């Protein structure tokens, strides 16, 4: 009669603190290293996928990206690194990172026409095209904003307001234009000194254009600056401009209640369900440690940077 010994086969060498190579049987692992390299769904709600466009290009209506109009509700955003199209006209979007942070996890997205294009009887809304944003060989411009120029020979002062009568918050975008010299201004806006003044119940702003000589990007010696705001179910928004105005046409309706991040990757789509997602692929593991990728969205196990987390329960 003896006791023990029932280990007979297999080979699952492991290590301890004071001895570094023991042959333990029926070992086990709690390290996550196998994964399904495919993008999939998060708790039923499907993420938003932009193929070859940026967030700013999508929200402003890039003429080279017109397939994305219907976006009911999502969780996170998949945007490929170094997207090609982007802003066709050079410039910048003020507070881009705050908008990117907030725009993730929107629980209701919808498009409405707040100021129709027939609401400018005394201006021009057709000669606002540019050669840096083409469309099938003909020059074009964005689709959600309107660039206004002089109608007969003048740019009368604009005084327009909008009252929120819906039951949801809205998101509004407008902009300003920077000329090149003093000759360009007259052919577009007769007035030589211009301004914009936008005011709400919690906002105050006044701007003026900058005129100087700069370099050439995409055959344009000029820039364009954009802004955004959020107004409440009872408040109103007021505008006033003597020139260099990019008027709004469409505004969105949002509900918020959540925050998430943006995923930069280029992997294929699939049918699936999980809790967390990595840029390279998906994972549905319950073990507490992993090895794949640090950046993640959702609830995920920890990062250890190791390969050999074997614990085991074997005799001898």
């Amino acid at each position: 009669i003896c006791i023990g010994y029932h280990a007979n086969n297999s080979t699952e060498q492991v290590d301890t603190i004071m001895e570094k190579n023991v042959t333990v049987t029926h070992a086990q692992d709690i390290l996550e290293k196998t994964h399904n390299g495919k993008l999939c769904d998060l708790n039923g709600v499907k993420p938003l996928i932009l193929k070859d466009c940026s967030v700013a290009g999508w929200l402003l209506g890039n003429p080279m990206c017109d397939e994305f109009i219907r976006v009911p509700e999502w969780s996170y955003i998949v945007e490929r690194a170094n997207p090609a199209n982007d802003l066709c006209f050079p410039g910048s979007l003020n507070d881009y990172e705050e908008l990117k942070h907030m725009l993730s996890r929107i629980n209701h997205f919808e498009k409405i026409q707040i100021i129709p294009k027939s609401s400018w009887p005394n201006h021009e809304t057709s000669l606002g095209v540019s050669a840096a944003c083409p469309y099938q060989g003909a020059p074009s411009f964005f689709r959600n904003v309107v660039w206004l120029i002089k109608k007969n020979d003048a740019y009368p002062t604009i005084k327009i307001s909008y009252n929120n009568t819906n039951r949801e918050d809205l998101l509004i975008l407008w902009g300003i234009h920077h000329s090149n010299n003093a000759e360009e201004q007259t052919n577009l806006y007769k007035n030589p000194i211009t301004y914009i003044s936008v005011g709400t119940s919690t906002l105050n702003q006044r701007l003026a254009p900058k005129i100087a000589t700069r370099s050439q990007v995409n055959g344009q010696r000029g820039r364009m600056d954009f802004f955004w705001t959020i107004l409440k179910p009872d408040d109103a928004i007021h505008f006033e401009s003597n020139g260099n105005f990019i008027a709004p046409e469409y505004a969105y309706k949002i509900v918020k209640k959540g925050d998430s991040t943006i995923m930069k990757s280029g992997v294929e789509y699939g049918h699936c369900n999980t809790k967390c997602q990595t840029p390279v692929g998906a994972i549905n593991s319950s073990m507490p440690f992993h090895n794949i990728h640090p950046l993640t969205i959702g609830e995920c196990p920890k990062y250890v940077k190791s390969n050999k987390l074997v614990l085991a329960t074997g005799l001898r």
Partner: antibody, heavy 121, light 109 residues
Framework: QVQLQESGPGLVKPSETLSLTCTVSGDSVSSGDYFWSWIRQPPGKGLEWIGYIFYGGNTKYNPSLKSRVAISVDTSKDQFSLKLTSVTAADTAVYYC?????????????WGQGTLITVSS | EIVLTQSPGTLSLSPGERATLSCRASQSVSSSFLAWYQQKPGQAPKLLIYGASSRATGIPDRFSGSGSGTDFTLTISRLEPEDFAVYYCQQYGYSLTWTFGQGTKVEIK
């Protein structure tokens, strides 16, 4: 502001090609905000359209002189040239270089000076 | 092909009066895509009116114009000895067919 200048051969035999050169001073050919075009004018007749080229490589043509026309751009010696082939006896006229704005278009502002091309054997 | 025709053929006027040059169309063209020119022999046509009635820089105040829809009408106010040339209508746009007209002329009474 731009100024244009054109010069080319004054007599060309039939069934061969035809060439012209247009040189610009002031701004650059790579401006990206202009409509470099070409316009014809038969003596004793009206004007006509042949086509234009703007920034990039995009171009458009008339539905009359389409298969026998071509406009090219060279960015080294600030030039753009036109090459019309399959010449017939009814293509003798003055020739014009033209330019125009693209945002807030206001017709054709600046013009060249003109040159006569007569085809015969 | 939007064919444009100029109704008068030749107008002879003594100095002082006004001209009623008018060019119609076959398909209705907008009022933001029309222009007028002046052609003197030798040199090239220049710009007089762009839009429908807006005036081009340098043109004196005597030159005016009006019209919308399909029918337009140019009108010079007073006849000065220099005004004797040939004018062309144009339909510049993004319809990819820039069609001029056959022209008109004015000479001494």
């Amino acid at each position: 502001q731009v100024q244009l200048q054109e010069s080319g051969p004054g007599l060309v035999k039939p069934s061969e090609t035809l060439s012209l050169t247009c040189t610009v001073s002031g701004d650059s050919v790579s401006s990206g905000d202009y409509f470099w075009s070409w316009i014809r004018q038969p003596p004793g007749k009206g004007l006509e359209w042949i086509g234009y080229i703007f920034y990039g490589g995009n171009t458009k043509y008339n539905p009359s002189l389409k298969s026998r026309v071509a406009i090219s751009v060279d960015t080294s010696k600030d030039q753009f040239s036109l090459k019309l082939t399959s010449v017939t006896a009814a293509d003798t006229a003055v020739y014009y270089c033209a330019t125009s704005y693209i945002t807030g278009i206001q017709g054709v502002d600046y013009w060249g000076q003109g040159t006569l091309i007569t085809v015969s054997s | 092909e939007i064919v444009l025709t100029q109704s008068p053929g030749t107008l002879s006027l003594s100095p002082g009066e006004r001209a009623t040059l008018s060019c119609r169309a076959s398909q209705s063209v907008s009022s933001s895509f029309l222009a007028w020119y002046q052609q003197k022999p030798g040199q090239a046509p220049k710009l007089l009116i762009y839009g429908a009635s807006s005036r081009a820089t340098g043109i004196p105040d005597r030159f005016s114009g009006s019209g919308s829809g399909t029918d337009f009408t140019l009108t010079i106010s007073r006849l000065e000895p220099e005004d004797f040339a040939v004018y062309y209508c144009q339909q510049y746009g993004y319809s990819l067919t820039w069609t001029f007209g056959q022209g008109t002329k004015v000479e001494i009474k």
